[PDB]
Amino acid sequence: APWWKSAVFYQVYPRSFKDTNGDGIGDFKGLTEKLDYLKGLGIDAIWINPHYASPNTDNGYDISDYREVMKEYGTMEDFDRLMAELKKRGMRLMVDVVINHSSDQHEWFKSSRASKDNPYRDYYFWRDGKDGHEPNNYPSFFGGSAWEKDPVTGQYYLHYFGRQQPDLNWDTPKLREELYAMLRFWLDKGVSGMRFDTVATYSKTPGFPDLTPEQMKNFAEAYTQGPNLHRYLQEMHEKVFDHYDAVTAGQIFGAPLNQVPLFIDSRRKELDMAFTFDLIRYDRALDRWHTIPRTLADFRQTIDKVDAIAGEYGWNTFFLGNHDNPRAVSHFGDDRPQWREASAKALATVTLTQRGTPFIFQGDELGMTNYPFKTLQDFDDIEVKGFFQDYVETGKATAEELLTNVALTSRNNARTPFQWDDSANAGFTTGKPWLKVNPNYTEINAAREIGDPKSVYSFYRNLISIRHETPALSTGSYRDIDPSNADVYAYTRSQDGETYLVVVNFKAEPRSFTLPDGMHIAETLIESSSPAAPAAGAASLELQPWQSGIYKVK
């Protein structure tokens, strides 16, 4: 097993992690000076969100130069220092790779758009409109049509995401070669990993025919069905990742779960592991903003299916939070004062005992919660603006209805400044933060929790150590004890004759758990919200509200 199967990752959204110069935006020197903190927590590797030159219409995901560092984060020297300081700590760096699209301010697009006949025309998708409208009926994730007309040439360009995020043309060999050289630029600097943003949408459908009514309903899935997708991913592995020791992780958004093995089966020489969307969006509607009621049964059944697509040769990541989703404890736990800490601990136990490489999203180790928006403009984000364009301006929904749902689902919930201490703006900045800090920072902050052995932080820290010292908890088999149970999440992890039992009550009421026949408790490794460990030999557990536990069984 390669190092990454037993690693615990931490995701840093540098823009909201640590500001060191008072401009209100997190930067590299902030991250670097917090490495001791991350090492102390027990982190093996960090994935950072995009760190490249960008106009920031999508906070890093609209890249205007792949070979320069974003001005807000620092200089190339700062990046070099970050890597050096990670390596001194024995820690690895995974960077975000955004090559489905570039900023419209990238010099390639500026050149491409300039005329119909120039050497950069085919680095993007340019097409005549049809019948006085767009080339076809493709919608954008960020509002309106995915085609944007350019008065310079009178043709439309393709953008699945923002209008200022034109899609790169993977059908053009010279463009593919540019991407590979660019990736070598960073890999030559020693980065240890790459995460590929929307890796499944690289291939476009020949001829751009209209989406059928059915496909229009789930266009996200349709955009992942490009017929040259795996050809391209395989070429990239051959031309790039074969020549380095870096680990690769694809964000496979939109793709049906049964296709995931095509990305991660090691024999296929594409990616090493998968970020899948099934679990994190298990309670999201197809419109991507409405919530849908779900139970623990739905939660655990999704995990089981996702675990199954890995098989002997594939590998999954596991995460309950990221920069594109609401806060873990609010989303999956219960963020009310009486249950925030208890449920946050419970989800920690889950995260660090799943099969796959766990990714901890910044702030979740403190039990940070969703933000208490009012209306606009606490919601300033290109995605929400698109929801407004598609659903409110069109009369399909009111602003209150949109805001009611996006209060619960907006990715802005996960982008509020990390809560370091109880000083002004939670010690995140000495100025005014680009996004308001959650007022609960006075209670939920790192300085308070690091000194408290009962804290969510301390629990995550203890779990990370337990996972590090217990091979079965990383690479062991996974078996769900009862996929139909909507109250208590219970499963085993097993390897080399050693079996561990994980038991997590998802209700705020007492519950019981009968171990499967033949199985008894041998040792209790850890528990949360439990006044006392079970007796050695127990065939049953009595669970306090939101109790979690890890036990070795006999």
Ligand SMILES: [Ca+2]
């Ligand atoms: Ca700054």
